Structure formats: C-alpha cells, structure tokens
Structure 1
Amino acid sequence: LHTQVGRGLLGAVVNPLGEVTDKFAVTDNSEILYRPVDNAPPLYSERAAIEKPFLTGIKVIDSLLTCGEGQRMGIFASAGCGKTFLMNMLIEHSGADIYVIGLIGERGREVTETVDYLKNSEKKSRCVLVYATSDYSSVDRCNAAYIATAIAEFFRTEGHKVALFIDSLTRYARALRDVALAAGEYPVSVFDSLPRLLERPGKLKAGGSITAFYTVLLEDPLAEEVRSILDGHIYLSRNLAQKGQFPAIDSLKSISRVFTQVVDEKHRIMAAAFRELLSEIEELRTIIDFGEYKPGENASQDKIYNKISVVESFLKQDYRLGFTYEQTMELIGETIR
C-alpha cells in the first residue's frame, strides 16, 4: 500500500515488495521517502496540454511518430520483433531526466538482461528498475506496476521530466485477471485497475511530466482498447523484422495522436510527403511481386523504385546510434527530395 520513493532509488533494482534487492549503479544521493502506491490521477485542470515533443533520438519516431511530453504511447509487438531493444533505444537516445522501468511478469533471465543492460548504460545513474518475475504472485505483479508509477510520480512532482516504461501491460493484465477471480469475480472491479493505471502519466502544470511507454504483446481484444485509451501506438512488424529492417516499426500502421500538436508546419509537410512516398513504395512492392514491374514503362514507378534504398536507409537505425532532431529532419529532407 506504501512504497519507497526518492533519489536514493536511482541506480537500484526493486522487487514487488518495494525493497531494493540489487543495484546497477551507485549515487551520492540517499534520499528515501514513502508514498502510497495507489494514488488518484490528476484533475483535468491540473494537467497541462501536450505541446512539447519528447525526442527519442530514433529517426522514424521523431519524424513520423513524434512523441509528446506527458504522452502515453503503446508498443505493440509479438516476441520477438525487438521490443526490448526498442525500449533500450528509447532510454539511451532520448533526453529524459529520469527513467523508471517496470518489468511485469518477465521470466527472470529477462530481468537479469535488463539489469546487465543498465549496468553498462550511460543512463545508469538516472534509472530505477522495478520487477516482478513469473515466480511471484499475481498480486505482486500488479503492485510492480503501481510501484513503478508511484516512483515516477514522485520525480514528476519534483519537476523532473520522467519516462515510464511498463513491460508488459499484457502480463500485468493477466495478473489482474487472476487477482480478479480471487474474491470471486461493484463499484470496484479488479478489471478497472487498467484505466486507473494508464491515466496516471502526464504533464502537470504545477510539476514535471511523465511520458509513458506501455508494451502490449501480440499473438487480443483489449490490445485493441489499450489502444483506445492511449495517445498513440507503435507497431513492430514481424514482416519488417524478418527482412532485417531495424527498428521493425511499421510507420503506416503506427500513430502519435499528438503529432500535429508537437511539431511545426515545416515538419508536418515533410512527414506527410514522406508517408505518401512510403505508401507508393508499398504499392510498387505489390506490383513487383505480382511480376508487373518492367523498368522503362512507367516513369513514375521507376522514380519510386529508385527511392526504395534511400527510404529504407532512413528507416534503418543502428541501436547504438542516436540522432538529433535537426539531423533527423535533415535526413528525411534528402529522402523525399
């Protein structure tokens, strides 16, 4: 019902009981406070409008799927489309003050993977990790989500720009379902914990912000209405991963619902122009695989064909590399020209 919060948790690993069990970094700060894990979402009047971009350093995201400070973004993928590696990129190449990661229902190898990743990360001293493995109860998995959010909420009230990661909402949802049948399942369900959890992030007028990334596993009914609640979603295409396209983000099947609110007109024009070229390329891919593309016949098709490699090159991104907003807009500029 209460968890540890504060700068003293920076660099630490926290189990579903709110106790530190490991560290991936050590900091000079030792601030430890206590707050409840279940807190009310901000009043609408307390919430600031999402107007400022949350840069990720990932070209396809920053250019076509631009995130906003205080936004909730879904990450939809089937294991493995490189979901974990996308999250790692989001941590490395963004510029948040503090990163809070909640790993829900992960095998435990997996938990150690994230820890070993953080142990060599440059963001190590700005991260807090909360985990719940497959060996913990369904109640403990749910609390892992609340603890991570509550930890993030404290940093937000201090005015920090916080990025919250929940991997995954899928395993969290199962745990919630198992908990629901406990006590045999007015006016409180166990099923409604999911919206309460998701409306907690955001930018506060009086405080910092929480930009949250919720991962959803694909193999689902409420995968479709976690989508309904959030402010956008990123889809990792299995097709794109197998073609060696990394990150395997399907731009055309993804959206940031705050896109036009966080980029200027010049950006908006380039993005729209890029998406059309993308659509034209997909049309040609079909025509090619149908065996109806002969060079020389249609000048427009030939012009589109010769744009495929530069477009693919723009979408491609080494996971170790991060791009500034000026670089991304510069690159997409030569792609559509």
Structure 2
Amino acid sequence: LHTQVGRGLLGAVVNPLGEVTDKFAVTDNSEILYRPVDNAPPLYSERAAIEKPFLTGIKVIDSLLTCGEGQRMGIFASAGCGKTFLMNMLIEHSGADIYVIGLIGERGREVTETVDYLKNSEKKSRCVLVYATSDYSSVDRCNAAYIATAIAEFFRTEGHKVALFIDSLTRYARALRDVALAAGPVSVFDSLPRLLERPGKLKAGGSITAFYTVLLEDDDFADPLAEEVRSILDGHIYLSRNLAQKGQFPAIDSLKSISAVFTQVVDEKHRIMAAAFRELLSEIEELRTIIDFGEYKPGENASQDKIYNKISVVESFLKQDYRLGFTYEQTMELIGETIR
C-alpha cells in the first residue's frame, strides 16, 4: 500500500514488495521516504499545458513524432520488433533528470537483460528499476506498475523532469484481469485509466513523460486493449514487423504513428519541413507498390524517377544506430537535406 521513494533509490532494482533487491549503480545520496502507491491524478487546474518538447535523440521521433514534457506515448509492437532496444534508445539519448522503469514482464532473464543494460549505461546513476516477473502473483505484477509510478511522482514533486517506462501495459492488463477474477462502485479494471492519468507536467512541479508498451498479436494486429489504450494516450509509435524484416531500425512506421502534441511543441518552420517529409514518405510508399506491380520503368515518368532517387537518402535519415543520438539541430539539418 506504501512504498519507498527518494534519491536513495537511484541505481536500485526494486521488487513488487517495494524492496531493493539489487543495484546497477551506487550514489552518495541515501534519502529514503515513504509514499502511498495509489494517488489521485492531478486536478485539471494543477496540470500545465504540454508545450515544451521532450527530445529523444531519435531522428524520426524528434522530427515527425515530437514528444512533449508531460505526454503519455504508447509504443505498439509485435514480439520481435525491437521494443526493448527502442526503450533503451529513449533512455540513452533523451535528456530527462531521472528515468523510472517498471518491468511487468515474464522471465527473469528479460529483467536481467535490462539490469545489465543499465549497469553499462551513462544514465545509470539517474535510473530506478521496478520489476515483477512471470513468477510473481498477479497482485504483485500490478503493484510493480503503481510502485514505479509512485516513485516517479516523488521525483516530479521535487521538480525533476522524469521519464517513466511501463513495459508492458499488456501484461499489466492481463494481471489486472486475474486480480479482478479473484474479486469476481469500483472495478479492478479501472486501475488502467487511473494508472495512465498519473503522468503529466504539473504547474507546481516538474513532469512525468511516460512511455507505455503494448504487445501486438499475431501480426501487428490491434487488440481491444490496444484500441482502448490508444484512445487514452497522447499518441502512439508503431513498430512495424515489415520494416524490421526489411532491416530498418528503429522499425518505426511514421505514417502510422502520431504525437498528439506535435503542433504544440514545435515551431512553424519545423511543421512545414515535417509535412513536406511526410508527403515524400507517402510518395515513396506509392512508388514501392508500383515497383511491386512491375509498372516502374525509368525515364517514363519524371516525377516517379525523382521519387525513386530519394529513397536512399530517406532510408538513411530514418535509420539510426542504437548507440547514436542526434541533437534537435542535427535532426532538423538532416531532414532539410532529404526533402531538398
């Protein structure tokens, strides 16, 4: 019902009972305080408008899907689509004060992979990991999400710019379903929208910008749950199995992805360039079909040939080594080159 919070958790791995069970870093701050794991969301009047970009260092996101401080963004992917590597990039190449990761996963190996990632991360001294494995009870799996969120809420009240990751909402929701069945005004199912409303920028405080993962099954298809979360969140990033099998990483399909706060967090010249780039992406997808139909013949259509010769520079812009991060200025310089 209550959990540890505070700067003393930075570098720690926390289990569903809210106890530190491992460490991927040690810091000289030992602050440990206690807070309830369930808290009402902010009043509308306590929230600030999302108006400042949350930069990710990822070219396709910062140019076409720009996130804002306080936003909730869904990450939708099938099992082999690089969800975890994307999450690692979002941590490594963004600029948050503090990162809180809640893993509502399956095997301990997955957890251990994240711990060893964090052990070697530049961000290790500013991260907290909360986990629940498949072996823990459904109650414990749900609580891991609340604990992670409550830890983030403390850092927000202190004025920090916090990034929160919940992987995955899907396994959170399935645990919630089991907890509900154990019980049969309040439904155990309402714990999903009350969880998702907790992030945001506060007028009196800092912010929580939150990324929630959703699994797609079989083939990039949208669960009823996928549909419900999509409607609650402020946007979604879709990782395409097709793009991944083509070797494009990150496998973000920007034409099927959206940030709802985009026009609110970037300026006009950015808006113009992104719109132009999206039109070019659309033209490339049309040409790709024509090529598959065997109807593309060089020299027959000058506009088609011009689009053909842009495919390479566009793919190069979208593609990104997971170890590399780009500044906003760099990203906008690069996208300008591609549309020219």
Give the TM bin, normalised by the shorter chain.
over 0.9
State how far apart, in whole Å, the 1-side matches of 2:85 and 2:311 are.
25
Q: CA deviation at 1:173?
A: 0.2
Tell me the SS of whatever aligns to 1:136.
Answer: coil
Q: CA deviation at 1:222?
A: 1.6
Q: CA deviation at 1:106?
A: 2.6
**1:259 matched to which residue of 2?**
262
State how far apart, in whole Å, the 1-side matches of 2:175 and 2:157 are.
29
State how far apart, in whole Å, the 2-side matches of 1:270 and 1:238 are.
27
Tell me the SS of whatever aligns to 1:311.
Answer: helix
CA-to-aligned-CA distance 1:214-247 (integer Å, 9 cap, x gap): 0000001020110000000000000000000000
State how far apart, in whole Å, the 1-side matches of 2:141 and 2:192 are.
13
State how far apart, in whole Å, the 1-side matches of 2:201 and 2:81 are.
30
Q: CA deviation at 1:72?
A: 0.1
Contact 2:50 2:265 in 1 (8 A): yes
State how far apart, in whole Å, the 1-side matches of 2:258 and 2:12 are.
33
Tell me the SS of whatever aligns to 1:224.
Answer: helix
CA-to-aligned-CA distance 1:175-223 (integer Å, 9 cap, x gap): 0000000121xx1001110000000000000000000000000001020
State how far apart, in whole Å, the 2-side matches of 1:211 and 1:119 are.
23
Q: CA deviation at 1:15?
A: 0.3
State how far apart, in whole Å, the 1-side matches of 2:277 and 2:108 are.
41
State how far apart, in whole Å, the 2-side matches of 1:281 and 1:10 are.
45
State how far apart, in whole Å, the 1-side matches of 2:136 and 2:196 are.
23
Tell me the SS of whatever aligns to 2:163.
Answer: strand
**1:135 matched to which residue of 2?**
135
Tell me the SS of whatever aligns to 1:222.
Answer: helix
**1:319 matched to which residue of 2?**
322
Q: CA deviation at 1:80?
A: 1.2
State how far apart, in whole Å, the 2-side matches of 1:176 and 1:273 are.
43
Percent identical across equivalent pairs? 100
Tell me the SS of whatever aligns to 2:176.
Answer: helix
CA-to-aligned-CA distance 1:18-75 (integer Å, 9 cap, x gap): 0000000000000000000000000000000000000000000000000000000000
State how far apart, in whole Å, the 2-side matches of 1:245 and 1:180 are.
40
**2:197 matched to which residue of 1?**
199
Tell me the SS of whatever aligns to 2:35.
Answer: strand
Instruction: Give TM-score, length-normalised by structure 1.
Output: 0.99
Q: CA deviation at 1:105?
A: 2.8
State how far apart, in whole Å, the 2-side matches of 1:27 and 1:273 are.
46
State how far apart, in whole Å, the 1-side matches of 2:252 and 2:107 are.
25
**2:300 matched to which residue of 1?**
297
State how far apart, in whole Å, the 1-side matches of 2:180 and 2:108 are.
24
Q: CA deviation at 1:154?
A: 0.1
State how far apart, in whole Å, the 1-side matches of 2:146 and 2:204 are.
22
CA-to-aligned-CA distance 1:102-125 (integer Å, 9 cap, x gap): 000331100000000000000000
RMSD: 0.3
Runs of 4+ in 1 over 4 A off after TM superposition: none
State how far apart, in whole Å, the 1-side matches of 2:16 and 2:102 are.
10
**1:9 matched to which residue of 2?**
9
Q: CA deviation at 1:161?
A: 0.1
State how far apart, in whole Å, the 2-side matches of 1:175 and 1:210 are.
24
Tell me the SS of whatever aligns to 2:188.
Answer: coil
Q: CA deviation at 1:329?
A: 0.1
State how far apart, in whole Å, the 1-side matches of 2:293 and 2:261 are.
37
Tell me the SS of whatever aligns to 2:231.
Answer: coil
- Note if 1:53 corresponds to 2:49: no
State how far apart, in whole Å, the 1-side matches of 2:204 and 2:318 are.
37
**Correspondences of 1:253-292 after superposition (within 5 Å):** 253-292=256-295
Residue ranges of structure 1 left out of the alignment (5+ in a row): none
Contact 2:106 2:135 in 1 (8 A): no
State how far apart, in whole Å, the 2-side matches of 1:296 and 1:105 are.
53
State how far apart, in whole Å, the 2-side matches of 1:133 and 1:65 are.
32
Q: CA deviation at 1:5?
A: 0.0
Tell me the SS of whatever aligns to 1:100.
Answer: strand
CA-to-aligned-CA distance 1:252-291 (integer Å, 9 cap, x gap): 0000000000000000000000000000000000000000
State how far apart, in whole Å, the 2-side matches of 1:144 and 1:304 are.
48
Give the length in aligned residue pairs. Answer: 335
Contact 2:105 2:111 in 1 (8 A): no
Instruction: Decide which structure has greater helix share.
Output: 2
CA-to-aligned-CA distance 1:143-198 (integer Å, 9 cap, x gap): 000000000000000000000000000000000000000121xx100111000000
Instruction: Give TM-score, length-normalised by structure 2.
Output: 0.98
Residue ranges of structure 2 left out of the alignment (5+ in a row): 218-222
Tell me the SS of whatever aligns to 1:228.
Answer: helix
State how far apart, in whole Å, the 1-side matches of 2:26 and 2:287 are.
53
State how far apart, in whole Å, the 1-side matches of 2:131 and 2:289 are.
44
Tell me the SS of whatever aligns to 2:75.
Answer: strand
State how far apart, in whole Å, the 1-side matches of 2:304 and 2:11 are.
53
State how far apart, in whole Å, the 2-side matches of 1:190 and 1:336 are.
49
